[PDB]
Symmetry: D2
Subunit: 339 residues, 4 copies
């Protein structure tokens, strides 16, 4: 048999991501085997260990899956912290671990803009917010800021200033100036919340110069439940992937089955799927040391294009060809031309 362990935060803080990771792995393996769930006569079984995103539990689960269930290889896990704990548990069992999503037994999944994006969101959440109010000088504006003010109090951001202008201010040079001076050199997030029945007139003044964003805009508040109450809706980071044969299958099949698009994490589990399946097929065995040999320098296909494990650090890199372009001809042409 071919036993793959998946350590993941099935319950707890990262439970939503953990769902995707498995669904992705199951579809990942299904593609790679053309639906047979067997690789070279070998039946593929998958053993899942909820580690509740707890580093102590994760270690025991990882130890358990190698030792008790006899998993040949492992993927995991949801939480970064937990996965770091697990690195030695791999060496301890002289069996490979693929880190996903989060020594010679560890293969890492790769750098990408989505993690960058998450790290970004994370820092933001871990920083201050300073808000600056803008409203009209009649009851509704002042009631308006009242309620917002009340929402902003369960929050932890600071309100530096409230500006109230007349119902009919069509020129906001002075307000906006007063607003920029209030948020100026603070960190971290500085924001002007307009309540109205001005974003435009204010955006023309270019607030970015101060690092100030306005209440109209995408995801200008930290991805915390406290703020998502003034602003409903989850914070998403968007990205695009050049179509390929695994893309199509994943997107079509996933949509078809769950009436929803695959996500970044879904695609991660699927990639680990390809790594394992590609590797075992390469090595023609499931012996750790023959597996490491196959994988070092191995290219494998993912929903994201061709990947390759760098042998030195066991890291997944996007797999390229290099091109260049000679620009002299076109420049010596372009000049001998405007004259």
């Amino acid at each position: 048999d071919l036993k793959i362990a998946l350590i993941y935060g099935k319950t707890g803080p990262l439970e939503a991501y953990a769902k995707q990771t498995e669904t992705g792995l199951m579809m990942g393996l299904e593609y790679a085997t053309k639906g047979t769930m067997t690789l070279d006569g070998r039946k593929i079984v998958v053993i899942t260990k909820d580690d509740q995103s707890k580093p102590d539990l994760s270690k025991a689960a990882l130890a358990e899956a190698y030792q008790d269930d006899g998993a040949d290889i492992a993927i995991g896990t949801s939480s970064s912290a937990a996965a770091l704990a697990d690195l030695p548990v791999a060496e301890e069992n002289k069996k490979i671990l693929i880190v996903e999503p989060a020594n010679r037994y560890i293969f890492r999944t790769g750098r990408n803009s989505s993690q960058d994006a998450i790290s970004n969101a994370v820092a933001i959440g871990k920083q201050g917010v300073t808000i600056a109010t803008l409203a009209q000088d009649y009851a509704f504006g002042r009631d308006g800021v009242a309620a917002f003010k009340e929402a902003l109090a369960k929050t932890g951001a600071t309100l530096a200033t409230e500006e109230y202008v007349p119902t009919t201010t069509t020129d906001f040079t002075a307000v906006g100036q007063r607003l920029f001076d209030a948020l100026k050199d603070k960190p971290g997030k500085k924001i002007i919340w307009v309540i109205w029945a001005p974003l435009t007139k204010l955006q023309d003044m270019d607030p970015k110069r101060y690092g100030i964003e306005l209440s109209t805009g995408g995801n200008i508040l930290p991805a915390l439940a406290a703020y998502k109450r003034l602003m409903e809706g989850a914070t998403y980071y968007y990205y695009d992937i050049p179509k390929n044969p695994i893309n199509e299958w994943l997107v079509t099949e996933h949509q078809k089955r769950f009436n929803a698009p695959p996500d970044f994490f879904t695609a991660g589990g699927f990639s680990a799927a390809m790594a394992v399946v590609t590797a075992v097929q390469k090595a023609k065995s499931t012996d750790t040391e023959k597996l490491i040999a196959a994988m070092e320098g191995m290219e494998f296909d993912t929903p994201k294009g061709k990947m390759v494990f760098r042998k030195e650090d066991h890291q997944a890199l996007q797999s390229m060809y290099h091109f260049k372009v000679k620009v002299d001809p076109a420049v010596a042409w372009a000049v001998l031309e405007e004259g």
Copy 2:
């Protein structure tokens, strides 16, 4: 048959590129037809027309191509301008023109980073160059900053100032130098030694570049600086990528370039279009081509119906960050 016309500056100012376009196009057709050079029982012939990168010549060549040789579809051309002259000829002749590399009969090739880069290089050549020299205050630092002064005098850059220090790879030196080049447009301190480092530790926060670095000069024949200027870019590997690079190398003993891959896509589009249309009639081709995805060495492209522009054919993925963020705090 299936007749395809390639217009290009086979000779003249853009001749280096023209050669890539053709090799590329020849190779695209081969890959697409598994070497048979026939599509759906149709034999594929290619007609080439040298327009010398002259608009007047290129208009005739294109007319001639359709009218005299019965080209069912054209590709071209090398020069941006000779290509603008050509747009009407396509319309006047009621046939398709795929514009490469440079109305309803025009289909374009997409925006990419090589073009931007060619763009930039062009802009640079059309702007000023100011130089400040840094040398040693003795015989051959001073003699070698004459050799240069001499060379630099046949180019078109101004020499704003000469600094001669003793041996002082140093601070006061490179400040006299920054203050000298500062607020000029558009383009360099040129070191002659037997300094760079110490200088580089201070920054370019001035727009200043050193004589170390790649392509700090305009890419002009006039400008110790041997060598062509290149813009480098990496592409995610794929089945056409591989075939191209592998075969090009094995054939030509050198990598395929941007204009090679450009020709390849031109070819992929024509073949995919004619396999889709099941005919070579202009109108049934315009219909097949609007919104059709085709495969190229850069991945899947697709023609936007609205403007006949080639776009990278994408899927859209999102990531929800709340959970992770909610996590990092607690």
Copy 3:
């Protein structure tokens, strides 16, 4: 006497900038002489010349100011084209020309962030504009025929129109992004929703929304009333305050870029004739070469090599090692 000529496009396309330039020059000279309009006993006299931003008029006008009116020194002019033409006039008259705001005889005002911003706006207006429409499936269609009409006097192109039922604008916004993608020039989604769309960060396609700031080229042709301004901040200083206090006091408006510009030039001339203790061209070129002078912008300096004016500055550095070595430990 001390005779100053100011060339400017007083009437014509750049007339707004001209009044600015004059006011500042006049206020510049006034601040500089503590209201006496006399520099070291010399009476200061200013001759203006409308060139209407026409280059061949502007050469005659400058020529007339040196020759007929006997100006010791000139300043001009409102348009860079008209002022490239004037360079030889000044040489052929053996007299200094201070180029503002736009030979050993020319001297320049400096490169600043507000110039760059104009070069920006100009590139943009000289570029294409493409727009895509989003509205409710009703007054959408009506309101996007009134726009379709308006935009038609414009010169932009309408790539697509998207109508949706009055909820979740993912698929819609995507259709909109795919529609505006790799086009050159400006891309804009004009909505008849906004936030949902902004959450998908259009910046990453080069697409602006119909909410951003100055999404359209500054052209009368472009709903969207109001002028396009580039904003920027200068650190207070004694000249600053005076300019801002008096200008705001006399005109109920703050000094703008062009007003401060005429001011700077005013400060240069005064500083020069005082340091030269004369008005002889040869001695003025001498005085100004490497010369420092205070402006509303701060302390400036004339680079001898190229007669360009630079922010005059001190250099500081900071050693990071001790602090870094601390952090790790």
Copy 4:
């Protein structure tokens, strides 16, 4: 009398900064009083406490400074951490602290380019360094690389690869070896520089041996020389006095920390002149919204958060006319 406390890391880890902070504080006071070292009849006294950059020492030193010495106000201190421990102390004593350089009693010094540069270097120093080797394939390339390997090994960086060509494909191998690692990725050349540069490593986030401050500012990596952030300041009457005098007295330029100490001194003298007293309460009142001149121009304390900000005038330009022009 007017009594001012300077808390600082005169000895220990931040001793060089502390020295400059003081020098600046003394000259700031000199210039402010035209050498008289008195303001409105008050002799000016300065008391220094070495906190050694120890936070527990520092809350003590500042405690002494207030309670024992009678310091009517305080400036400090060298460490950010020791400065943060000190915040309560000011409050606990009903006396003002100015945080420099690192409560309605705290007044801060401003965010700025130099501090952001320091913060930067710090981050960098707490991050990985990866190296890739390039030398000729003969005797003293391979030896020189050993020498370097010997040095690099007292470091904490990793040598991922060693490339030996004789005297494009090389620098391709090189780039691929460093591509997606964090943080610093460096090709070390022993001898080429120019050819590699032609290929623009920046697009892999890779730097070369030739370069300006490519290594963290740790003594192990120091490749001699200190690491500097360079910046420029618009000349003013204070600039000039400072630079000129410090250059006449110490035969070396003033630095970020000297000017910092100068600004602190300016805040105080300006404040105490404006208040006409040394009373904490009347001082907090005077300082809010207060403008004062420093070696880098006019600052003002923002009331809402007691933060110093470069004091600005806002100017704008209207571009329609010139675009409308450019087109027609």
